[PDB]
């Protein structure tokens, strides 16, 4: 029985003295029996003399030195299973959905090593999406990192909700929304809302699994929520063959949590107050986000940058990982578009000609040129007058404002919220719609016939209905 006695409690950095030759290995998980149930300490050093230095996950307030510790023997093993979908789970893999003990199959270590070069994606793949704006100008990609920008609420969370619905149709996938630095009140609303919109139904089926990591939870537990979440996803991917889409919240709070743990460990935080092991921490996490031969994880991450500084090293490191960036605009939401997506500031690097198909690319390039010209033209056209438009320019304006309306396409989750049943639009059919709009088949069809509709088929119906 590998046991050791607490020999320090300076902060949440608890040094434990183990009897000789009965030493845990680094990254092992220790459990200290406590009236707090357990305190999980993760061994992060060997200080020698048969003592270690560990970090704590659960708070150490009122800890008494010399208390016996028991060594689990390896990085925390968190429950996994289809059963575990629809559970709000704390870092230590215990229900915080409060609907009692998680029904589990197998439990698995929170730390895991990135798959081999061979088991990394050898050729790109384009994950299907149902938002047309997404499907043209930043098509999702399997194993991809898609970094959200723009406000929450009617912004990010509703968008995230839509994706879960779409994913369920798209594959039949699952998700795990991991929320780091989560305001627990807002999280409650999200959980209740997620229940209401039925992406979680525990009287039914719950696709998304929730891991909420509140800000009041210690920094160590803030750091470890992500690694746990990825493991859950990986059980689906590798061992249930699934394709999943894993939401992560703020990576500012990912950085923030890690930075503290480094500083506590005594490691000199590099410039702009960010840990020396900054690169590696993203590196391990975001190289476990990949398309394996068994399945593919795909991760939608939320990238909240502090002070709008993209020059900050942590955002830069994020952008290195990011394959796409989705930049929600509030101006766009104000143009009556839900999608709230800013099409000209939404960009993906997987958008290249061959990558998305030549037709798709050419259509996209035209739509980009159309929108780019529409905006620029509208700048001085508004000032000069709309009648100062050329025949070509007002053809473009006519088409463009029709495209602007065409962007409006309710979201399935937002069936209640907008009041209009969502319009799911498949990627091929999105291209088809734009080919026709480019060819002006719908430039004789009214603007608000494109308002709040989906694909080509949908706007055939609405074209008729707007008139009739």
């Amino acid at each position: 029985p590998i046991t050791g006695k607490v020999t320090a409690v300076i902060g949440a950095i608890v040094d434990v003295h183990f009897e000789q030759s009965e030493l845990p290995a680094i990254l092992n998980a220790l459990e200290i029996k406590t009236p707090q149930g357990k305190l999980v300490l993760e061994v992060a050093q060997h200080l020698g003399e048969n003592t270690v230095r560990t970090i704590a996950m659960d708070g150490t307030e009122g800890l008494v030195r010399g208390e016996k510790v028991l060594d689990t023997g390896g990085p925390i093993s968190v429950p996994v299973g289809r059963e575990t979908l629809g559970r709000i789970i704390n870092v230590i893999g215990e229900p915080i959905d409060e609907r009692g003990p998680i029904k589990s199959k197998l439990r698995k270590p929170i730390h895991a090593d990135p798959p081999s070069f061979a088991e990394q994606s050898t050729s790109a793949e384009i994950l299907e999406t149902g938002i047309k704006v997404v499907d043209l100008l930043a098509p999702y990609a399997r194993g991809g990192k898609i970094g959200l920008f723009g406000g929450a609420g009617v912004g990010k969370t509703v968008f995230i909700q839509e994706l879960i619905n779409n994913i369920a149709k798209a594959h039949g996938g699952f998700s795990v929304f991991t929320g780091v630095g989560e305001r627990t009140r807002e999280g409650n609303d999200l959980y209740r809302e997620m229940k209401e919109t039925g992406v979680i139904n525990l009287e039914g089926e719950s696709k998304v699994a929730l891991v909420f990591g509140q800000m009041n939870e210690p920094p160590g537990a803030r750091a470890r929520v992500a690694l746990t979440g990825l493991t859950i996803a990986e059980y689906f991917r590798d061992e249930e063959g699934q394709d999943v889409l894993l939401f992560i919240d703020n990576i500012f709070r990912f950085t923030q949590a890690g930075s503290e743990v480094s500083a506590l460990l005594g490691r000199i935080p590099s410039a702009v107050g960010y840990q020396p092991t900054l690169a590696t921490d993203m590196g391990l996490l975001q190289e476990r986000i990949t398309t394996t031969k068994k399945g593919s994880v795909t991760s939608v991450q939320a990238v909240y940058v502090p002070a709008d500084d993209l020059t900050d090293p942590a955002p830069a490191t994020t952008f290195a990982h990011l394959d796409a960036t989705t930049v929600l605009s509030r101006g766009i939401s104000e143009l009556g578009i839900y999608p709230a997506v800013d099409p000209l500031d939404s960009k993906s690097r997987l958008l290249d000609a061959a990558v998305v198909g030549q037709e798709h690319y050419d259509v996209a390039s035209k739509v980009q040129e159309t929108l780019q010209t529409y905006k620029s033209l509208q700048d001085i056209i508004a000032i000069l007058g709309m009648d100062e438009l050329s025949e070509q320019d007002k053809l473009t304006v006519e088409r463009a404002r029709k495209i602007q309306r065409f962007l409006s396409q309710p979201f399935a989750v937002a069936e209640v919220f907008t009041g209009i049943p969502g319009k799911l639009v498949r990627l091929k059919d999105t291209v088809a719609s734009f080919k026709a709009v480019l060819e002006g088949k719908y430039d004789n069809i009214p603007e608000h016939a494109f308002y709040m509709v989906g694909g080509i088929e949908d706007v055939v119906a609405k074209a008729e209905k707007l008139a009739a």
């Binding site: 409690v9 300076i10 409060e98 509140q214 800000m215 009041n216």
Partner: protein
């Protein structure tokens, strides 16, 4: 006499001093005694010196246990016996602190008798869970009309009062507390918000004035003032909001509602900086300790509106952050802004231009917002938001030949800006906020000359009070504005406008 009573009390102590574990200071420098002993001590536990000093034990190191002294070093010297009290910090909690200005320990610094409160409960305890909360929907009305309309506040939520130094930041806060007297008088205990003002680093003369003002407005009997004054030591300052929160928990747990105003966490930060540096822990960004985010977050999620199974209660909070140059970009402001759910950012220029409240409408947001807004006030001030938006754009149009629409906006907007002035230290009733804003919405006030707006306001209120306090009470009690009431109001306003 009184002396005899004290001597009797002294006779009443004689307890066996078998101190299971004692300590001896090895060296004491910088208020960081390093003690030999204290084998079984709990972390952060309260320790009593020979000097009588109180401490917490942040560092439990193997060879020495590094007490951080709450007390002054003046009497402390090496070798001092360190009795182990064996109790982690706890403060009296209960309704006993209503109208009681107490220090962190619980000593009544106003000396309004030894605090007799329900229980003494520990200073730090972890924040309510997901399921232990239910969403906010209950308003709270600060009397400040602009606050109530532009950024409507609710219960068990956090939302900043972030603004520039000595703009009477405390004055803006104090106004809310004063309006809580009206609601306090009211029977419902959600309407009884038992306010807690946490005066951090604030000089005792200033807090004495605060206390006196509170006494003048007879507010000390729902108010609680947790005081860590300028002199009060950095451990006391550090634990001061945590200590305060626990007091709030009794109310919250009792299902009641209450409002805790942490003023200012910026001075809390400095105390933590002092502490961290004294323990030689590396100072984080902007030389403010790295776990300041963690510290503030631990405190700030205790502000929560509990679920109805947890007896629908709350601890509303309104943290005050001092912006040194107005920089919300400053590390502590940026962090706090992220943590909280809304901010109100007072504008120094407006303050200078005598517009008190000095609120920067754009840089004030409430995320809960209109969910926690009176329906009546919501109806008659949705318009106000849009009007002000135009007014902001047409602010620069004050540099003239202007479009008639623009010139109208400018007139309407200027009258509105004056209307939202509310002289400091005079709250207003909600039943009197709603008619005035309705008038402005209907453009009735636009016609009234700017100088005569003031005369109009008080007069209109009395005119309404005389003409139809039946309407006012009806409006107040219904809390909604029906088409019939708004109709009558438009008419009533017309009648008043004529005079």
């Amino acid at each position: 006499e009184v002396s005899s009573i004290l001597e009797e009390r002294i006779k009443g102590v004689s307890d066996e001093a078998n101190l299971n574990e004692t300590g001896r200071v090895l060296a004491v420098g910088d208020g960081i005694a390093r003690v030999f002993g204290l084998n079984n001590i709990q972390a952060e536990e309260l320790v009593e010196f020979s000097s009588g000093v109180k401490g917490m034990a942040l560092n439990l190191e193997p060879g020495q246990v590094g007490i951080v002294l709450f007390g002054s070093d003046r009497l402390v010297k090496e070798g001092e016996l360190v009795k182990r009290t064996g109790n982690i910090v706890d403060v009296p909690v209960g309704p006993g602190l209503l109208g009681r200005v107490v220090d962190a320990l619980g000593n009544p610094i106003d000396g309004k008798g030894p605090i007799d409160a329900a229980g003494r409960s520990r200073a730090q305890v972890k924040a309510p869970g997901i399921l232990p909360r239910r969403s906010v929907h209950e308003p709270v009305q600060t009397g400040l009309k602009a606050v109530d309309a532009l950024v409507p506040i609710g219960r068990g939520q956090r939302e900043l009062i972030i603004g520039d130094r000595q703009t009477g930041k405390t004055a803006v806060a104090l106004d809310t507390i004063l309006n809580q007297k009206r609601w306090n008088n009211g029977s419902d205990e959600s309407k009884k918000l038992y306010c807690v003002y946490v005066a951090v680093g604030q000089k005792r003369s200033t807090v004495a004035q605060l206390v006196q003002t509170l006494e003048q407005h007879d507010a000390m009997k729902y108010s609680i003032i947790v005081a860590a004054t300028a002199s009060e030591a950095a451990p006391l300052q550090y634990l001061a909001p945590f200590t305060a929160a626990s007091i709030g928990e009794w109310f919250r747990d009792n299902g009641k509602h209450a409002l805790i105003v942490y003023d200012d966490l910026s001075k809390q930060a400095v105390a933590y900086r002092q502490l961290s540096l004294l323990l030689r822990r590396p100072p984080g960004r902007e030389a403010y300790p790295g776990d300041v985010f963690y510290l503030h977050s631990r405190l700030l999620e205790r502000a929560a509106k509990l679920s109805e199974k947890e007896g629908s209660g709350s601890l509303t909070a309104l943290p005050v952050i001092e912006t040194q140059g107005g920089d919300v970009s400053a590390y502590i402001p940026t962090n706090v802004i992220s943590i909280t759910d809304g901010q109100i950012f007072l504008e120094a220029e407006l303050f200078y231009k005598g517009i008190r409240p000095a609120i920067n409408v754009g840089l004030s947001v409430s995320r809960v917002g209109s969910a926690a807004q009176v329906k009546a006030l919501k109806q008659v001030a949705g318009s106000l938001k849009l009007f002000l938006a135009q007014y902001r754009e047409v602010a620069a149009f004050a540099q003239s030949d202007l479009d008639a629409s623009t010139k109208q906006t400018l007139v309407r907007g200027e009258r509105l800006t004056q209307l939202l002035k509310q002289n400091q230290y005079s709250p207003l009733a909600t039943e009197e906020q709603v008619p005035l804003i309705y008038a402005g919405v209907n453009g009735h006030l636009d016609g009234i000359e700017l100088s005569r707006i003031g005369e109009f306001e008080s007069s209109f209120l009395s005119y309404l009070k005389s003409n139809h306090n039946e309407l006012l009470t009806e409006i107040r009690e219904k809390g909604e504005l029906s088409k019939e009431l708004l109709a009558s109001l438009k008419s009533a306003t017309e009648s008043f406008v004529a005079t």
